[PDB]
Design a protein around this ligand. Structure first.
Ligand code: HEM
Ligand SMILES: COC[C@H]1O[C@@H](O)[C@H](O)[C@@H](O)[C@H]1O
Length: 374
């Protein structure tokens, strides 16, 4: 029914192993099989991330930005050095105290929604929850979330973000405090301080990498719980399954469908030739439905123990935001289980990704849902 996300890649995954799409006259070969997505994600020499800024993104962003994202657009061994700088900052959501503040934010927004009765989840719920949670990760004042909410859910809009980041970098530059900007400006890369340009590459990536993905993860979870009262019930009675429930939702929703790489030399994948200087994609969504790897791949098995999903990527570039994202979803699932009796989906419109030969439901442009109290 309505919460379903179908697998548009099945026939091609099983028959050829790959697909094609056009994106700004820079054509893509999509890798669809779990085995191949892993081998290719691991093999950075042949399939590289350190390209012209914006080239590995799909759709390509070469025409809307010049700044290199870090560590996203850097290859090992330099990748490892930058990643070691920011990785302790990204593990902060594992702290008790960070989790209490996040529990209070999510709990407050769930109570407000139970009072309003019905709400438009994408904007009134998911975007608010994501913007506020992000203030904990950046360690900025709560109020900064109102600016981010205003941006909503593309050359001129892009520059709104880039210029905002520059202002923040300059402000922290003059008056160092404890926010992520100040921490990055004071960090060392091989015995010297990071430059503003490097900080900008971390921060643009931090804002852009976690916005849409989190908003869809949150929204798709609510949709799914709305149509599956038995799942809401298991989560209430068996809180111990919550962690595995979150991984299973990231596998099935795969909020980030694919990511590109640039092919450095002539080579083959599934007996198919790919020429140097072209792009492939690591199609995480398809790998996460591979019937050679997952039992019942097109359902949510709420307590799945064996779950080698690639929803957060694989090997070198595995998602730094995963710790933050996981805590958001763990807490959300428990807050709904302990406070909401059931839901009704009242009206919706689907967000379909145009991938040329493939049309992929990634979530909802909007969906109106009623929450009833327990
Ligand atoms: C459920 C939500 C999320 C999903 C599904 C997701 C998914 C992914 C995926 C698949 C990658 C691999 C990219 C690649 O191979 O090139 C990735 C990388 C990354 N994500 Fe996320 N992400 C999510 C949330 C976040 C959040 C909230 C942030 C930050 C606030 C974030 C920051 C990053 C960063 C910095 C990387 C690059 C890591 C590196 O290059 O070493 N993500 N993410
Ligand atoms: C790992 O994902 C990072 C990317 O997310 C994309 O959706 C952004 O738009 C890109 O600029 C880039 O940050």
């Amino acid at each position: 029914k309505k919460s379903e996300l179908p697998d548009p890649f099945e026939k091609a995954r099983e028959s050829k192993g790959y697909g094609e799409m056009n994106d700004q006259d820079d054509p893509v070969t999509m890798l669809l099989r779990h085995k191949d997505v892993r081998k290719s994600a691991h093999n950075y020499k042949t399939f590289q991330s350190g390209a012209v800024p914006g080239r590995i993104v799909i759709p390509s962003e070469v025409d809307i930005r010049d700044t290199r994202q870090i560590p996203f657009e850097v290859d090992p061994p330099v990748h490892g050095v930058y990643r070691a700088i920011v990785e302790p900052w990204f593990k902060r959501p594992l702290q008790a105290e960070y989790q209490e503040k996040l529990t209070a934010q999510i709990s407050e927004i769930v109570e407000e929604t139970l009072l309003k009765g019905s709400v438009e989840v994408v904007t009134d719920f998911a975007l608010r929850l994501q913007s506020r949670a992000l203030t904990l990760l950046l360690n900025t004042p709560f109020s900064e979330s109102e600016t981010w909410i205003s941006w909503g859910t593309d050359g001129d809009k892009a520059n709104i973000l880039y210029h905002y980041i520059d202002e923040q970098i300059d402000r922290a530059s003059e008056n160092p405090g404890d926010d992520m900007y100040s921490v990055l400006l004071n960090s060392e890369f091989e015995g010297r301080k990071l430059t503003k340009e490097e900080v900008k590459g971390v921060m643009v990536l931090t804002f852009a990498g976690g916005r849409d993905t989190v908003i869809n993860a949150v929204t798709n979870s609510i949709a799914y719980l709305a149509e599956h009262p038995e799942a809401l019930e298991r989560l209430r009675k068996e809180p111990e399954i919550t962690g595995r429930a979150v991984e299973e939702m990231i596998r099935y929703f795969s909020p980030l469908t694919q990511m590109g790489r640039v092919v450095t030399e002539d080579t083959h994948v599934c007996e198919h030739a790919v020429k140097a200087d072209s792009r492939i994609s690591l199609c995480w969504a398809s790998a996460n439905r591979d019937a050679a790897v997952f039992e019942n791949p097109n359902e949510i098995v709420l307590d799945r123990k064996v779950n080698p999903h690639v929803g957060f990527g694989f090997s070198h570039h595995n998602c730094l935001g995963a710790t933050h994202a996981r805590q958001i979803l763990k807490i959300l699932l428990q807050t709904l289980a302990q406070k909401v009796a059931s839901f009704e989906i009242l009206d919706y419109k689907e967000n379909i990704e145009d991938l040329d030969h493939f049309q992929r439901k990634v979530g909802f442009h909007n969906i109106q849902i009623k929450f009833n109290p327990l």
